[PDB]
Amino acid sequence: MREIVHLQAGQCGNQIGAKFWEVISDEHGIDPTGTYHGDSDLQLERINVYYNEATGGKYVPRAVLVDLEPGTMDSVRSGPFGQIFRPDNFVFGQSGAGNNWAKGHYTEGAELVDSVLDVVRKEAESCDCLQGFQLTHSLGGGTGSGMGTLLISKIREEYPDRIMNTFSVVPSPKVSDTVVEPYNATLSVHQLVENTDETYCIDNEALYDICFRTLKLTTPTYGDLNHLVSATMSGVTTCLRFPGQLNADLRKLAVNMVPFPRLHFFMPGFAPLTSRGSQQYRALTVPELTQQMFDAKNMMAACDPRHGRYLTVAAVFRGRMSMKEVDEQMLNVQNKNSSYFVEWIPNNVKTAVCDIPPRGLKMSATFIGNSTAIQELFKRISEQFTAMFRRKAFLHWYTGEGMDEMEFTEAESNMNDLVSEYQQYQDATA
Amino acid sequence: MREIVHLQAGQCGNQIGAKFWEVISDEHGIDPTGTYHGDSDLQLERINVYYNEATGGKYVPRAVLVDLEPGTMDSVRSGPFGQIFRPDNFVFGQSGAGNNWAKGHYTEGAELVDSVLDVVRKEAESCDCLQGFQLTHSLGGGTGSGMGTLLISKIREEYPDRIMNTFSVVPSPKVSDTVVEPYNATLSVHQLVENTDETYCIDNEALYDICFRTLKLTTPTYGDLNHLVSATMSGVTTCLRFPGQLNADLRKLAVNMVPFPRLHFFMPGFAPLTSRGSQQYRALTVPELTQQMFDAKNMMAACDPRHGRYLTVAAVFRGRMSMKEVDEQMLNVQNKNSSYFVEWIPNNVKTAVCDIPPRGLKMSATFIGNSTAIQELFKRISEQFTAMFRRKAFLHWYTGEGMDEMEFTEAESNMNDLVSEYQQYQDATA
Amino acid sequence: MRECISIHIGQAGVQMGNACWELYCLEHGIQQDGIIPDDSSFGTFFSETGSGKHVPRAVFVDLEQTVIGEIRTGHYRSLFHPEQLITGKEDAANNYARGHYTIGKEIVDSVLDRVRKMADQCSGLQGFLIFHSFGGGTGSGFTSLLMERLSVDYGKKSKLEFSVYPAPQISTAVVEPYNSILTTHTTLEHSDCAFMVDNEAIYDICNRNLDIERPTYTNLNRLIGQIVSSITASLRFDGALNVDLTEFQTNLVPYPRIHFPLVTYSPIISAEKAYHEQLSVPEITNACFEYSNQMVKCDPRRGKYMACCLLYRGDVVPKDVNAAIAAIKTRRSIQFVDWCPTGFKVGINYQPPTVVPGGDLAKVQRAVCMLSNTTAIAEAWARLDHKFDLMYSKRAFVHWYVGEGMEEGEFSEAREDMAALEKDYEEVGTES
Amino acid sequence: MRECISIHIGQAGVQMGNACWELYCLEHGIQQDGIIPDDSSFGTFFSETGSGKHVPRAVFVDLEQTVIGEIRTGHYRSLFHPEQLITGKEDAANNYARGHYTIGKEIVDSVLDRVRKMADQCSGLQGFLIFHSFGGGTGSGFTSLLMERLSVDYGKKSKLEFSVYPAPQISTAVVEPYNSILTTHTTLEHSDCAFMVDNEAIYDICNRNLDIERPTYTNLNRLIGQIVSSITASLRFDGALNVDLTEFQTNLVPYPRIHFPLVTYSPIISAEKAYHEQLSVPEITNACFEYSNQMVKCDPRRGKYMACCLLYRGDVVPKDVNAAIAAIKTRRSIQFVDWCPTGFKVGINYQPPTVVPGGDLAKVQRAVCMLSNTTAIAEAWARLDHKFDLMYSKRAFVHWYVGEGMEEGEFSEAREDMAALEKDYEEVGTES
Ligand SMILES: Nc1nc2c(ncn2[C@@H]2O[C@H](COP(=O)(O)OP(=O)(O)OP(=O)(O)O)[C@@H](O)[C@H]2O)c(=O)[nH]1
Ligand SMILES: Nc1nc2c(ncn2[C@@H]2O[C@H](COP(=O)(O)OP(=O)(O)OP(=O)(O)O)[C@@H](O)[C@H]2O)c(=O)[nH]1
C-alpha cells in the first residue's frame, strides 16, 4: 500500500540517503543487519512502505544508489549501516563527472542510466501499489544534477501518474563550493520544472545558520546537517507509515501546496530545535512550537520569507497533541502576519496530525512553505548566470561533451520566466 | 516404466555426462559405490528410471560412454565418481578425431559405432518400457559432432517411435575455441534436424555471462558450467522420477514445444540463480522466480529472445508451490510481453509442477523456449560458412576421409532453409 | 420499529462512526467482542446471527487503507463484518475529482453490492444515515457518488447525512471551498436534509461549557455521537410522541433545496460542574436558542428560524415541554418567519442518555437535541461562496482537477447553482 | 436407492476422485483402512464384503503409472480393490490421438472387463459418473473411447460427467483447443449432460470468498468434491423431494446436444469468516445468480438461463425455497428464455454437509448447489472455436496427430460440428 521507492544520486544524495535510511530504520526499529527489532506493532503494519521482505525477516530497503564513480558508494558499503542494502541496487560507473552537467547527463550518465532503470522497474513491479518516487540529489554537482535530471525524466515517462518529489541542495547566496554552480544549477532547474511535482529546496548556509544559532554545536560536519534534512523528509512520509488523527499523503501535500503547476518549489522547516543542556529551560507545548515554524530563523532556505509573501503552507504535526491548538494557532498566525500571506487565497495553512512522534521525542512539526521570496534565489542565479554566460566563461567544458550553447540560452530564458511568474502574484487582489 | 538410456559422446559430452550423473545420484541419494543411501521412499520407486539393479543393491546407471580415444574416458574412470559405471559400457578407440567431422563419422567412428550399438541394444532390452534416448555432445568437436550424429541416426533407425532428445553446446557468437567450428556445426545440424525430436542449444559465452553477472564467482571452470547444464537437463526428466501435481513427460514437452517438425531447436533456462552470501537478501517466492525466466539475462543461448518472437514456452516447476501463481504469473507474463509472442498461437505457455525440489533447494523452474531469435545463430553460422567455403578454406582435411564437397553444399542449402522457415513466422496473422 | 443503514464515507465519517457505534454498544449493552451478554430495539441497527454475536448494520468505505485499518485492527475488530469494511489502495488526496471520477468509481460498485446484499436482508427499512465531511476527497467525492447511486437503486427512501461543514475561520485544508461547493451541488438534488456541524463551534463549546482546555478529534466526534443517538432514539426506544425517521424531512424541509438544519444539543456539562445545576425543562430548552450553543458557528439572530424540532430524551414532562416551547415563541429577539406560525415539532423517548466510560460529559437525567432550520446558515454559504470566487477568479487550483477527468465548466456551474441557493434563501427570508 | 459407478480417467479425473472419495468415507464414517467402524446408503457407492471392509464401486484408469501409483501407495491403498486400479506403461503426452487411437485402445478393453464384472454385481444400477479433463490425452481421448464403448454395452443408462473445461485466459497446455474440441465432438452423441468447471473461476472464487491467498490442486479438487456429494446426495440420504440420478437430464436437457449445465455452489465461506454471516435461504439462493459465483468463468448476464436445479442440502425450509425461488423469477437482470416458463427443479436431502479434517470451508448448517443451463456458455465455446481456427489455419500442430493414426479431415469435421453447435445455441437463444 502506497510503497515508496527511494532514488539517491550524487555524493550529496548518497550521504543524505545514507543518513536518511538510518533514521527510518531507527523509527521502525530495524536492526542494521536487516532484522526488525522494534517494540510497536505499528512499525510492522507499514514496514512494507519502505522495506521489502526476504525470507528470514531480512528487510531489504528499496533504495537505488547511483553514482558515476565508486567513490561515495564504496564508503556506504563499508559503513556500519551499509550491509542492509541489496548488493544489486548499487549502480557504479568507472569515471565520475567532473562537476559538469553535460558529462553526467549525455556522455557518461547515458551509459549508466539504462542500468539503473533496469533495477527501478524491478522495484516498481514488486510493489502492489507504488505511490511515487523520491529523489535526493544536489544541483551544484554533476552526477546529482546531471544523472538525477536524466533519470527523473526517464522515470517520468514510464509512470506519469505517480508522484515524483525531490530533496535538493541549492547554491548558497554568498559562498560557493563549486565554481560552475550557476551553470549546473540553471540547467538542472529547467529540466526539473517540467518533470517534478514538488521540490524541497535547501542550502547549506541556511542550515549552517541553524547549527550555531538555535542549536549550540560548533563544528557541525555534513554528517549532522544531513540529519536535519533526514528528519524533515521522514516527516513528510509519516502518515503513510503510522496512524494519525488527520492523515496526510504525498499527493495531499502536492494538491494543497501547488496552486499552479510550475510554482511547486517549496522550502522546508523543522521543530523543535534546541541545544542540549539548555533544552530543559524550554517548554514543549504547541504554542511555542508553532511560532518556531513561521520565523526566518528556522528556515532551511537561505531566502528570508519576510521579503516575500506566503502562497500555501503545510504543517505536518506528530505525537499526541490537542487538535484545537493545532488549528487555533494557525488562525492566530494568519491574522498576526496577514501581510505575509497573499489575499487571493482565502486560507493558506494545511494541517496534518500523526500519532507517533519521532524517536526520542514527544512532539514534532515539519513545516513546508511555498513563498514568493524564493524568486530571489532564482533571480540571484540569473544574476550569476548572465555574468558568466556574457563571456562564455566555461562553455567549452560543456560543448565538448555533445551540447550546444543554444541550450544555455533556453535554460536562462525559462529561469527568467519562472522568476517573473512568482513576481506576478506579489500584487494584491484587483 | 519409461526408462531413459543416456548417451554421451565427445569430451564435452563425457564431462557434462560425468557431472550429470553426480547430481542424479545426489537427488536419488545414491552412494558413489553404487549403493542407495537416500532418505525418501520416492527415490527408490523410480530408481529404475535411470539405474539398473544388480544383486546386492549395486545400482548400475545405463549410460553409454563413447569417445574415439581413451583420453577423456580414462579420467572419468579414475575420477571419484567413476566406479559406479559398468566397465563394459565404456567404449574407447585408439585414434581420436582431429576435430574434423569426416573422420569421426565415416572412417573412425564407423569402426566403433557398431561396438556401441551392441551395448545400447542390451540396455534397450533390459528395460520393460524404454521411453527414449538422451544424447549429450558438442557440435564444435569431431567426436561429439561426428559419432553423435552417426549414432543418433543408427538408434533412430532401430527405434523410430521413441523420443530422442539432445543437449548440445553450440558455437559462441564472437569467440571460437576451434578454427573449423562452422564446418562441423553446419554438417551436424543437417544430420540432426532430420533425426532428433528436440535440441536444447547452449553456448559457453551465454553460460559465462551467467557465472559473473547473476552469480558472483570469477574463474568458473568447465566443471561449474556443466553443473548448470546438469541441473537443467535433470529438471526435464523430473516428472518421470518423482510425483507432482501436474506431471510432465519427455513426449509432453515435445508435443507442446514443437509446432512444426523441423522447428524443434529450443534454448533452456534455469532458476533460482543467486551468488552465495548475497542470497539472503532475496526472496524465493514464485513471482520473482517467474520474471527471471523471461529475461535475456538468464538465457543459456547467446541469442537474445527480445530480437525475435516466442512460439512455444514450457515452465517445469518443482517443489511445494501455489498452482494459482504458477498460472497467474504466466497470464500476466503473456500480456506484459504480448509483442514477444506470435499471434497465430492463442496460448504459448506450458506449465508443469513437481513435488520434490532439487537437492539443497525448495524451489526450481527449468525454463524452455522455442523462439524465432535462434535463427540469428544459424544465420551467423551461415555467414561464417559461406566465407570459408567460398575459398575451400579447409575442405582438404574433409575430402581426404571419404567425403565429397557436394555434401557441404547440401548442408549449407538445408541450413539456409531452416533459417528461412523461422523467418516466415515473424509476420503476424493475415 | 425497523432498520436503518449507516454509511461512513471518508476519514471524518469513518472516524466519527467508530465513536457513534460505541454508544449503540453501550446503550444496548453489546460487548465490544460482538456477543450480547446473557431487546426488540437493537434489530433496527444490528443484524442477528445464529450465534449470540450481533452484526452492526453499517458499511465503511475509505480509499485510504490507513483509517479503516485502525478499526480493522482495533479492539472493535470482531464487531464488524469483515466484508463491510471496504478499503481502496490509494487516497483521494483531498481532490474532489479523484474521489468522484477516477478512483471513486473504481470501488463504488463494490460498496453498492454490500448495501444491496444488506438492504435485502431487512424485513423493514427506513433510510440511510451518511457520515462524511465537506473538506476531503473520499468524504466529498465518494459521497456524491453514493447519493447518486443509492438514489437510483433505493429512491424514495429517506437519505439523511451528518456533514462536517467548513468552519468560518479555522481551516484544515487549502482546497476546502473548491471541494465544499462541488459536493453541495451534486447532493442537493439527491438528499433529504443534511445535519451540518462545525469543529470551530464545537471547539468553542467544548472549551466554554464542558471546560476542558485541550480537546481532540477523539473527543469532539463523541458529542456528534450523542446527536445521532438522540436523533435515532425514536426508532429504538419506546416513549410518548415518537418521531420516526421519515418525519424529520417533512417538518424540517419547507422546500426541496432548503434542507440544511444545523444541529444543536443541550446540556453539555462536565461531571463535576453539574452538581450546582438544576436542569429544568426551560433551562435546557432555553440553551438551544442562543449564539453560544450551536454545532455550526452561525449567529442565529442574524437570520430567522423557519422550522425547529426538539427531540426530548429521558424522563420528561410533556406539560412543561408544551409550556417551555410556548414562551420561546413570544420573545422579540427570537423571530420565526411570517409564513410558518406552526414552528415546533416535539418528540419524547423514555431513555435518558448513557455515558461513555471515561466520557467528559455528565450523567444528565434529561436531554434535548434541537434541529432548527434557520436562514442565518445562508451566511455560511455566502461566506463560502466569497472564498470560491476569490480563488477561481485567478484559476489558481483548477489544474489538479482537469487532470482527473473533470471539465472546466463544472466549477462555473456549481457556483451559479450556489448563487441561486443564496437567492432562494433571500426570497424565503421575506414575505410576499 | 441403488448403485452408481464412478469412472476416473486421466490425471485430473484420477486426482479429483481421490478427494471426492475422501468425502464419501467421512460422510458414512468409513475408515481409510476400508473397515467400517463397529447404513442402507453406502450400498449405492460401496460394495459389501464378507469382512467389514467395504470396496468402493469405482474404476481408475490412467496411461501414466505415476498418478495411480501415488494412490496405490498412499494411505488409501487398502480402500480400493487392486484390480480396479488400471495403469498403462507410457503417458498419452497431451495428444488426443494417442489416448484414443494407438495406446488408448491397447488398454480400453481391460477397463471394460472390470466395469462389466462390476456392473454385473449390482442388483440395481443408475448410471455412470465420469471424471476427466478437456486438456489432456488420457482425460480426453480415453474418455471418448469409454463413452463409445460404455454406450454400446450399457446404452440407455445415464452417463454423467464432470469435466475441467479450458479456462478463458489461464492455460496449462499449448494444445488445449485441439484436444478440447476433439473430445467434445465425439462425446456429444454419447453423453447425457456434462458438469463443466474451470480452475480460473474456482481460483477466482477461492481467493475472493474462501480468503486463502495460495490455493493448489489439492485444494480446488475438494470443492469439486462437494458438488459431486451434493449431486449424489439424493441417491444416499433420505429427505423430502428427492431427485434421482436419471432426473437431472430430463430437467437440464431441453435438447439432446444442449447438455452443458455449468456448476455453481454456495455458500463458500471460511471457518473464521462464517461467524458474522446468517446464511438465510434467500442469501444462499441469491449467491447462485451472479457472475461472481460460478465454477465456469462465463458472465451469465450475457446469456439467458433455460434450466436450473437447486439441490438443497441439510435442514431446509421447503416453504422458503418455494418463496426464495419465486423472487428470482421476477428480476429484470435475470432473464429466462421465453419458451421455458417452468424453469426450476428443487431437491432437498436431510443431511447437512460434512467437513474434511483441516478443510478450508466452514461447517455450514445448510447448503445448495445450482446446475443452471445457460446460453452464456456458448461464449466459452465461441472463444474456444476462435483459438482452434487461428492454429489450424496455419496447420501448426497437426503433424503430432497424423503420426498417431488420426486422419487430417477429423479436425475439419470437429470444428464444423462445433460451428453447428454455436448456431444451435443461437437459435435456442431467440423465440420463434
Ligand atoms: N468531527 C470530526 N471531524 C473530522 C474527523 N476527522 C476529520 N474531520 C474533519 O473532516 C475534514 C477533513 O476530511 P477527512 O474526512 O479527513 O478527509 P477524507 O474524507 O478522508 O478525504 P481524503 O482524505 O481527502 O480522501 C476536516 O474538516 C476535519 O476537521 C473526526 O474524527 N471527527
Ligand atoms: N480441478 C483439477 N484440475 C486438474 C487437476 N489436475 C489437472 N487438472 C487440470 O487438467 C488439465 C490438464 O490435464 P491432465 O488431467 O493433467 O492431463 P491427463 O488427463 O493426465 O492427460 P495426459 O497427461 O496428457 O495423458 C488442466 O486443465 C489442469 O488444470 C486436479 O487435481 N484438479
Ligand SMILES: Nc1nc2c(ncn2[C@@H]2O[C@H](COP(=O)(O)OP(=O)(O)O)[C@@H](O)[C@H]2O)c(=O)[nH]1
Ligand atoms: N547536506 C549535505 N550537502 C552536501 C554533502 N556533501 C556535499 N554536499 C553539497 O553538494 C554539493 C556538491 O555536490 P556533490 O554531490 O559532491 O557533486 P556530485 O557528486 O557531482 O553530485 C555542494 O553544494 C555541497 O555543499 C552532505 O554530506 N550533506
Ligand SMILES: Nc1nc2c(ncn2[C@@H]2O[C@H](COP(=O)(O)OP(=O)(O)O)[C@@H](O)[C@H]2O)c(=O)[nH]1
Ligand atoms: N560446457 C562445457 N563445454 C565444453 C567442455 N569442454 C569442451 N567444451 C566445448 O566443446 C567444444 C570443443 O569440443 P570437444 O568436445 O573438446 O571436441 P571433441 O572431443 O572432438 O568432441 C568447445 O566449444 C568447448 O567450449 C566442458 O567441460 N563444458
Ligand SMILES: [Mg+2]
Ligand atoms: Mg497425465
